[PDB]
Each structure stands twice: as structure tokens, then as C-alpha cells.
Amino acid sequence: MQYDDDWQYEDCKLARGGPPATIVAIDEESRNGTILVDNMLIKGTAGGPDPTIELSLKDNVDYWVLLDPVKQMLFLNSTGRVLDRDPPMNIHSIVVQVQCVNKKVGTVIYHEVRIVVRDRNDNSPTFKHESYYATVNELTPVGTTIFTGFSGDNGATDIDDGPNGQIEYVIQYNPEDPTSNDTFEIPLMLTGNVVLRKRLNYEDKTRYYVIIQANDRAQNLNERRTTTTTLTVDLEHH
Amino acid sequence: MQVNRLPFFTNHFFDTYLLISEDTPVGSSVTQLLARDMDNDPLVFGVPGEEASRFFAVEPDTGVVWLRQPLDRETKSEFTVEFSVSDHQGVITRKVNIQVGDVNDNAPTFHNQPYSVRIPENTPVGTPIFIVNATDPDLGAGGSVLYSFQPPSPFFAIDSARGIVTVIQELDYEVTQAYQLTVNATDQDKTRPLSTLANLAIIITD
Ligand SMILES: [Ca+2]
Ligand SMILES: [Ca+2]
Ligand SMILES: [Ca+2]
Ligand SMILES: [Ca+2]
Ligand SMILES: [Ca+2]
Ligand SMILES: [Ca+2]
Ligand SMILES: [Ca+2]
Ligand SMILES: [K+]
Structure with a gap:
């Protein structure tokens, strides 16, 4: 009968239903030997004294993946380097092929594996400069924006992706310049522009030290990173 | 006075990816965008940018994303798509990788x-x-x-x-x-x- 020997074509086919690609996700900077795929679920036995299949990896660019044929397990090979999703490495995904050769009949099937690398909040906000400065005239009206120096990557940036990499700025109380957080304000935390909120008086106070903290927007408040800088504001007479 | 707070997406797929099989019929829903706003503002969703918007449409009030023309994995096997949400004062956008499933x-x-x-x-x-x-x-x-x-x-x-x-x-x-x-x-x-x-x-x- 036709198709009596279709059993010999079974090896190398998926032992599961579902779509052909096998897609998984793991955290960036996962440790060497981290499991990527527990079981490829391919029919047949690789390795041992009487295998029905040969398994191996193709298009394993930079050798990120290691295969254990007997378990049909894929592992991260990260020794002496880190799986980094952030600039400059920018690895968002690893795609490899598991080649399976059916020993009995000689057919080859390629099983595609996509590994999606998930972003960690492993980077803090970073200020382009060690400190910032503004000069303001004494008759500046209250409500005037007196500092915009964080505009256009000149302030804090964070190399992480999404909210892990979005910044908010807030003014903190300065116990060595107590009135500075009362005299200046950041009403729009996303821009970090500082506005004057009390009338200045050059005859009384000529310099303010405004402590400004940038934070990122990680989902978990306990995983947020922060960094502080100082804005020194000098009054001018002319 | 409270300054406006911009809205933010909450879908967890933005942290990983979104899988859509290439045999999804045109007109079918592939997901729903979700977002919140601390002001309780009513939100309008969109898909700006030309290439993404040829394949994907979004119902502006509900965030239901749907398929505007056939996907073909052999032709294009993935998209990076920016979705937008707006509280009528600002818009924010956010990207997701979309993987096209094979049949x-x-x-x-x-x-x-x-x-x-x-x-x-x-x-x-x-x-x-x-x-x-x-x-x-x-x-x-x-x-x-x-x-x-x-x-x-x-x-x-x-x-x-x-x-x-x-x-x-x-x-x-x-x-x-x-x-x-x-x-x-x-x-x-x-x-x-x-x-x-x-x-x-x-x-x-x-
Ligand atoms: Ca990293
Ligand atoms: Ca990161
Ligand atoms: Ca960060
Ligand atoms: Ca709002
Ligand atoms: Ca196709
Ligand atoms: Ca075919
Ligand atoms: Ca196909
Ligand atoms: K960023």
C-alpha cells in the first residue's frame, strides 16, 4: 500500500502543533549558560549510540547559541562578553536555524528559532555636563523661563529603551541654599525648563544653587534610577 | 492648577513583541491598545507614519488594531510599528516589533x-x-x-x-x-x- 513507509519521514518534524517558528524571550545581560529553549520538541533522537536524526545550528552569527542535541536544548554562550540590548551593541534579537537531518531518508528540515531580547533598566540618567548655569536679570518677571539648557540632548539622557529611557526632572531642597527650591520651579517635568516663581532682590541675594534630579520612568518604582546635578543661577544688575 | 499629564501605554507587548500570523484575514483584529491618563482624559489612538499605516488601522476610541491589507511573511516578515495615543493636548508614541507568523x-x-x-x-x-x-x-x-x-x-x-x-x-x-x-x-x-x-x-x- 502507498504511504506504508511514511513513518520513516516522521523524524525531524516537530513533535508539537502550532506555527513553524519557535519564539522565546530572555533578558538582556543574562548569564552564560542561561536556557533559551528548554526543548525544541523535534521528533527523533540525536546523539546516543543509535540516533535517528542529526541536529546542528546554522546562521549562528557570533555564536550566541549553543545546542545540546541529546536534550534538544539551546543555551546562551555569553562567556567574556555581555548580551547587551542598549547602544552600542543593540542586540534586540537573535535568529538561528536548527538543521535536522533524517538519517533514514536523508531529508533536511530547518527549524527557525527567534530569541527576543528584553530590555532591563540597567542604565541610569546621565548629564552631558558636570554642572549648569544661568544668569538672570533682577527685574525678570515671575513666571519667566530662566533656564532651558536641558533642551536637545544637552541635559540628561538614558540609553535604555521605552520608559526605562525617558527622563523626568525635579528640583530638590538644598539644605545649604534653603530658599532655592522655593524661588525656582520645574512645572513641566519632561522638559526640565526652570521658571522663576518669586521676585528676585539683588540687594539681598545674588546667587542660587538649585539641586536638580533626573529620574527614569521604569514601571517598578523600586527599579528607577536617578542622577543629580546643580544649576547655579547668578543675578545680574545690568 | 494641575498641569496636564500625558497618557501612557500599558500593554506588555511593547516590552517583548506582537505575533500575527500571515493568514489573518483583512478586517480582523490583531490586538487592542491600552492606555491610562492621570487626569482621566478620554484617549484617541492612532497609527502615524506611512508604511505601518498601510497594513494596520486602529479604531481611535477603543484602541482595537486591525488589519487593513494582507500580510505576507515571504514578502515582509516583520514590522516596527509606532502607535500613538492622545489626550487632546499632547500625543505620545511608542514602538513595537511585529513578527509575521508563517503558514x-x-x-x-x-x-x-x-x-x-x-x-x-x-x-x-x-x-x-x-x-x-x-x-x-x-x-x-x-x-x-x-x-x-x-x-x-x-x-x-x-x-x-x-x-x-x-x-x-x-x-x-x-x-x-x-x-x-x-x-x-x-x-x-x-x-x-x-x-x-x-x-x-x-x-x-x-
Ligand atoms: Ca544593557
Ligand atoms: Ca537596558
Ligand atoms: Ca534607565
Ligand atoms: Ca492628560
Ligand atoms: Ca505568504
Ligand atoms: Ca510550501
Ligand atoms: Ca508562508
Ligand atoms: K533612550
Whole structure:
């Protein structure tokens, strides 16, 4: 009968239903030997004294993946380097092929594996400069924006992706310049522009030290990173 | 006075990816965008940017994303798509990688046609005389090709994996001078195998 020997074509086919690609996700900077795929679920036995299949990896660019044929397990090979999703490495995904050769009949099937690398909040906000400065005239009206120096990557940036990499700025109380957080304000935390909120008086106070903290927007408040800088504001007479 | 707070997406797929099978019918929902706003503002969703917006539409009030034209994994197997949400004072956008899932929707295509070969009457049993090859761009078993004669021939066989054609019985010119055989190349998809036919002319010389 036709198709009596279709059993010999079974090896190398998926032992599961579902779509052909096998897609998984793991955290960036996962440790060497981290499991990527527990079981490829391919029919047949690789390795041992009487295998029905040969398994191996193709298009394993930079050798990120290691295969254990007997378990049909894929592992991260990260020794002496880190799986980094952030600039400059920018690895968002690893795609490899598991080649399976059916020993009995000689057919080859390629099983595609996509590994999606998930972003960690492993980077803090970073200020382009060690400190910032503004000069303001004494008759500046209250409500005037007196500092915009964080505009256009000149302030804090964070190399992480999404909210892990979005910044908010807030003014903190300065116990060595107590009135500075009362005299200046950041009403729009996303821009970090500082506005004057009390009338200045050059005859009384000529310099303010405004402590400004940038934070990122990680989902978990306990995983947020922060960094502080100082804005020194000098009054001018002319 | 409270300054406006901009809205933020909450879907967890933005942290990983979104899988959509290439056999999703046009008009079908693929996901729903979700967002919140500390001011309790009512939110309007969109898909800005030209390429993404040719494949994906979004119902502005609900965030239901739907498919505007067919996906084809063999043509384009992934998208990076920016979605937007707006509280009527600002817009924020955020990107997600969309992976297009494969289904077996191609039959194999043969290489180096047309197929014809002249062989001597005294060609010994076992002799390889011809090699057929076909490829198939679907993934997995849907991309792995098997060859056969339809129907099988008492005089020629074809290796199901390698497409090597051999003589398996002594030929005889006076009985048959030429054979027209049909070669079938099929993929190995479980539920919907697809296949293709080519002719192979075998001319026996005296
Ligand atoms: Ca990193
Ligand atoms: Ca990161
Ligand atoms: Ca960060
Ligand atoms: Ca709002
Ligand atoms: Ca297709
Ligand atoms: Ca396909
Ligand atoms: Ca196919
Ligand atoms: K960033």
C-alpha cells in the first residue's frame, strides 16, 4: 500500500502543533549558560549510540547559541562578553536555524528559532555636563523661563529603551541654599525648563544653587534610577 | 492648577513583541491598545507614519488594531510599528516589533527547466542519469521538498530527498523510444501540503 513507509519521514518534524517558528524571550545581560529553549520538541533522537536524526545550528552569527542535541536544548554562550540590548551593541534579537537531518531518508528540515531580547533598566540618567548655569536679570518677571539648557540632548539622557529611557526632572531642597527650591520651579517635568516663581532682590541675594534630579520612568518604582546635578543661577544688575 | 499629564501605554507587548500570523484575514483584529491618563482624559489612538499605516488601522476610541491589507511573511516578515495615543493636548508614541507568523502557502518551484535527457539503450541498472531540484520558501516542513514520479515508473526511480533519477530496469529501444514522466515536488506540511509538477522527457538512443 502507498504511504506504508511514511513513518520513516516522521523524524525531524516537530513533535508539537502550532506555527513553524519557535519564539522565546530572555533578558538582556543574562548569564552564560542561561536556557533559551528548554526543548525544541523535534521528533527523533540525536546523539546516543543509535540516533535517528542529526541536529546542528546554522546562521549562528557570533555564536550566541549553543545546542545540546541529546536534550534538544539551546543555551546562551555569553562567556567574556555581555548580551547587551542598549547602544552600542543593540542586540534586540537573535535568529538561528536548527538543521535536522533524517538519517533514514536523508531529508533536511530547518527549524527557525527567534530569541527576543528584553530590555532591563540597567542604565541610569546621565548629564552631558558636570554642572549648569544661568544668569538672570533682577527685574525678570515671575513666571519667566530662566533656564532651558536641558533642551536637545544637552541635559540628561538614558540609553535604555521605552520608559526605562525617558527622563523626568525635579528640583530638590538644598539644605545649604534653603530658599532655592522655593524661588525656582520645574512645572513641566519632561522638559526640565526652570521658571522663576518669586521676585528676585539683588540687594539681598545674588546667587542660587538649585539641586536638580533626573529620574527614569521604569514601571517598578523600586527599579528607577536617578542622577543629580546643580544649576547655579547668578543675578545680574545690568 | 494641575498641569496636564500625558497618557501612557500599558500593554506588555511593547516590552517583548506582537505575533500575527500571515493568514489573518483583512478586517480582523490583531490586538487592542491600552492606555491610562492621570487626569482621566478620554484617549484617541492612532497609527502615524506611512508604511505601518498601510497594513494596520486602529479604531481611535477603543484602541482595537486591525488589519487593513494582507500580510505576507515571504514578502515582509516583520514590522516596527509606532502607535500613538492622545489626550487632546499632547500625543505620545511608542514602538513595537511585529513578527509575521508563517503558514504553508507556497508550493515548490522547480530549477533549470525544461527537463530532457538522452540516454543509451544499454545504460546499466543503477545508473544516475538526471537530477531534479525544487525549492520552497515556507518555513520548516512547509519548506522541505520531496520528489516522486506520478505514477511510479517500472524503469526509473527518483530519490525522494535528493532528486537523483536512476534507471532501475533494463531499457529496450524497440518497445519504447521516449518516456514522458511527471515529476511531483511536494512540501511536507502536516495539514496542508502543497505540490507542483514538471515534465521529464527521457529519450532512449540506440
Ligand atoms: Ca544593557
Ligand atoms: Ca537596558
Ligand atoms: Ca534607565
Ligand atoms: Ca492628560
Ligand atoms: Ca505568504
Ligand atoms: Ca508562508
Ligand atoms: Ca510550501
Ligand atoms: K533612550
